Design an enzyme around this catalytic site. Structure first.
Site, PDB file in Angstrom:
ATOM      1  N   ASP A 139       0.801  -1.231   0.000  1.00 19.51           N
ATOM      2  CA  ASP A 139       0.000   0.000   0.000  1.00 19.51           C
ATOM      3  C   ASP A 139       0.836   1.286   0.000  1.00 19.51           C
ATOM      4  OD1 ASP A 139      -2.158   1.874   0.230  1.00 19.51           O
ATOM      5  OD2 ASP A 139      -2.385   1.469   2.364  1.00 19.51           O
ATOM      6  N   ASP A 178      -1.182   5.299  -5.721  1.00 19.22           N
ATOM      7  CA  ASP A 178      -1.708   4.514  -4.600  1.00 19.22           C
ATOM      8  C   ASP A 178      -2.074   3.075  -4.982  1.00 19.22           C
ATOM      9  OD1 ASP A 178      -2.868   3.573  -2.266  1.00 19.22           O
ATOM     10  OD2 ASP A 178      -4.491   5.045  -2.210  1.00 19.22           O
TER      11      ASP A 178
HETATM   12  C1  LIG Z   1      -4.893   1.659   4.352  1.00 11.36           C
HETATM   13  C2  LIG Z   1      -5.860   2.047   3.223  1.00 11.36           C
HETATM   14  C3  LIG Z   1      -6.647   0.772   2.882  1.00 11.36           C
HETATM   15  C4  LIG Z   1      -6.602   0.205   1.596  1.00 11.36           C
HETATM   16  C5  LIG Z   1      -7.306  -0.955   1.254  1.00 11.36           C
HETATM   17  N1  LIG Z   1      -7.152  -1.391  -0.034  1.00 11.36           N
HETATM   18  C6  LIG Z   1      -7.766  -2.400  -0.691  1.00 11.36           C
HETATM   19  O1  LIG Z   1      -8.559  -3.177  -0.175  1.00 11.36           O
HETATM   20  C7  LIG Z   1      -7.462  -2.585  -2.156  1.00 11.36           C
HETATM   21  C8  LIG Z   1      -8.293  -3.368  -2.961  1.00 11.36           C
HETATM   22  N2  LIG Z   1      -7.989  -3.513  -4.262  1.00 11.36           N
HETATM   23  C9  LIG Z   1      -6.903  -2.916  -4.823  1.00 11.36           C
HETATM   24  O2  LIG Z   1      -6.599  -3.073  -6.153  1.00 11.36           O
HETATM   25  C10 LIG Z   1      -7.282  -4.003  -7.004  1.00 11.36           C
HETATM   26  F1  LIG Z   1      -6.829  -5.278  -6.762  1.00 11.36           F
HETATM   27  C11 LIG Z   1      -6.071  -2.137  -4.020  1.00 11.36           C
HETATM   28  N3  LIG Z   1      -6.371  -1.998  -2.718  1.00 11.36           N
HETATM   29  C12 LIG Z   1      -8.095  -1.604   2.225  1.00 11.36           C
HETATM   30  C13 LIG Z   1      -8.198  -1.109   3.529  1.00 11.36           C
HETATM   31  C14 LIG Z   1      -7.507   0.054   3.891  1.00 11.36           C
HETATM   32  F2  LIG Z   1      -7.616   0.522   5.144  1.00 11.36           F
HETATM   33  N4  LIG Z   1      -5.012   2.461   2.084  1.00 11.36           N
HETATM   34  C15 LIG Z   1      -5.359   3.172   1.082  1.00 11.36           C
HETATM   35  N5  LIG Z   1      -4.457   3.414   0.133  1.00 11.36           N
HETATM   36  S1  LIG Z   1      -6.907   3.809   0.941  1.00 11.36           S
HETATM   37  C16 LIG Z   1      -7.745   3.670   2.515  1.00 11.36           C
HETATM   38  C17 LIG Z   1      -6.813   3.198   3.660  1.00 11.36           C
HETATM   39  C18 LIG Z   1      -6.101   4.333   4.357  1.00 11.36           C
HETATM   40  C19 LIG Z   1      -5.248   5.255   3.701  1.00 11.36           C
HETATM   41  C20 LIG Z   1      -4.592   6.273   4.410  1.00 11.36           C
HETATM   42  C21 LIG Z   1      -4.781   6.385   5.792  1.00 11.36           C
HETATM   43  C22 LIG Z   1      -5.609   5.476   6.462  1.00 11.36           C
HETATM   44  C23 LIG Z   1      -6.261   4.460   5.749  1.00 11.36           C
END
Ligand SMILES: C[C@]1(c2cc(NC(=O)c3cnc(OCF)cn3)ccc2F)N=C(N)SC[C@@H]1c1ccccc1
Length: 376
Positions: free
Chosen positions: A37, A223
């Protein structure tokens, strides 16, 4: 440098569930699958027996665990997690041959965070300390890795799209077998998210002709923890209008463009040709110099298995542009932290057809690229 055979194909996942890498935590090592991530900065792992979880971190079993005696509470737009901060020994089995003492947030309560049916138990936040919770004093994993080892301050991602997905996270270098043509670099504007500047947008080579500040309102980020290409509201409606116009060979319900509906075609007869390419011009390394990245419908129309049905994976945003999996699946992406820049090259694994491929092209002459950045 140049070839990292042991790190090639170290990523797995499912469509819409993200890309994870195998990690070990504690002594003796406890194996966990961890979401890669670039849009966050915490190393946070399941530490309690949530029903969705295959595995979780059991601190009582680790002799090298150190309690930091501090809580962490992380609400975000689409969910919540909270935990207890600590440190422990961390390695990546299919990464560099090193062991690092890293900050670990042991997740003890969450909501809408873990995915029901997913094969990951934690998240590797690869962005910078400024956006780390609770504050910038909590050193992110990659910072600890670089400080404690001789691993160069660089990582690169090849995310390969589609139920199963795969790819590579090359820690400490670049693997030239993962891309074709040349890498083109965009400056990291500020070290918090991997923030970049978009200077021009084209749909099938037709310029959207918006004030370029709109493209980056209030930021543009890269991202791997987001699925969609997310665009600021004004940019989204301009883009959809243009995509509708270009694809008007077939009519679709308005709900499809809003991601409220799927569209289906008879097995293997998807009309890719009617859908336009999308080009994002990025600020280059040199004054007045840009390059463009170009994605296909194969990137932005994502397969939904529930004959061939698809979701429109470009969506409106109030947090600025998010270059999620939709963008990254087209490209080998180099997070060159040492030089404060991000490299893009055509991915050796991107999904395409006999007529069109994803492209990284330059140089182009673009003036006033600094004006494209938003300031508070
Ligand atoms: C940590 C955080 C986060 C991301 C995901 N991602 C996914 O489930 C996912 C699903 N499919 C994808 O591609 C296709 F295959 C990519 N990713 C799930 C739970 C989360 F909590 N990361 C972020 N960048 S967005 C919100 C959040 C966040 C960001 C910043 C600060 C706190 C929380």
């Amino acid at each position: 440098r140049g070839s990292f055979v042991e790190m090639v194909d170290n990523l797995r996942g499912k469509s819409g569930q993200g890309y994870y890498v195998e990690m070990t935590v504690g002594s003796p090592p406890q194996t966990l699958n961890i979401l890669v991530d670039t849009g966050s900065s915490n190393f946070a792992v399941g530490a309690a027996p949530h029903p969705f979880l295959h595995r979780y971190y059991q601190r009582q079993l680790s002799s090298t665990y150190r309690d930091l005696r501090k809580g962490v509470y992380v609400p975000y737009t689409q969910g919540k997690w909270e935990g207890e901060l600590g440190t422990d020994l961390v390695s990546i089995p299919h990464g560099p041959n090193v062991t690092v003492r890293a900050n670990i947030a042991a997740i003890t309560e969450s909501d809408k965070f873990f995915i029901n049916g997913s094969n990951w138990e934690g998240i590797l936040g690869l962005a910078y300390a400024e956006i780390a919770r609770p504050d910038d004093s909590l050193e992110p994993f990659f910072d600890s890795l670089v400080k404690q080892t001789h691993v160069p301050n660089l990582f690169s991602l090849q995310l390969c799209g589609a139920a199963s997905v795969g790819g590579s996270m090359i820690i400490g270098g670049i693997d030239h077998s993962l891309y074709t043509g040349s890498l083109w670099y965009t400056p990291i504007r500020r070290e918090w998210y991997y923030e970049v500047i978009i200077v021009r947008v084209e749909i099938n080579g037709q310029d959207l002709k918006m004030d370029c500040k709109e493209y980056n309102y209030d930021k543009s980020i890269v991202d791997s923890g987001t699925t969609n290409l997310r665009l600021p509201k004004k940019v989204f409606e301009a883009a959809v209008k243009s995509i509708k116009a270009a694809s008007s060979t077939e009519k679709f319900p308005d709900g499809f463009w809003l991601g409220e509906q799927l569209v289906c075609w008879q097995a293997g007869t998807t009309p890719w040709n009617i859908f336009p390419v999308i080009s994002l011009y990025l600020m280059g390394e040199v004054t007045n110099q840009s390059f463009r990245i170009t994605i296909l419908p194969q990137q932005y129309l994502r397969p939904v298995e529930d004959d061939d049905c698809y979701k429109f994976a470009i969506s409106q945003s109030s947090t600025g542009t998010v270059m999620g999996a939709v963008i990254m699946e087209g490209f080998y992406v180099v997070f060159d932290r040492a030089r404060k820049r991000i490299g893009f090259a055509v991915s050796a694994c991107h999904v395409h057809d006999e007529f069109r491929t994803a492209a990284v092209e330059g140089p182009f002459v673009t003036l006033d690229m600094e004006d494209c950045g938003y300031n508070i």
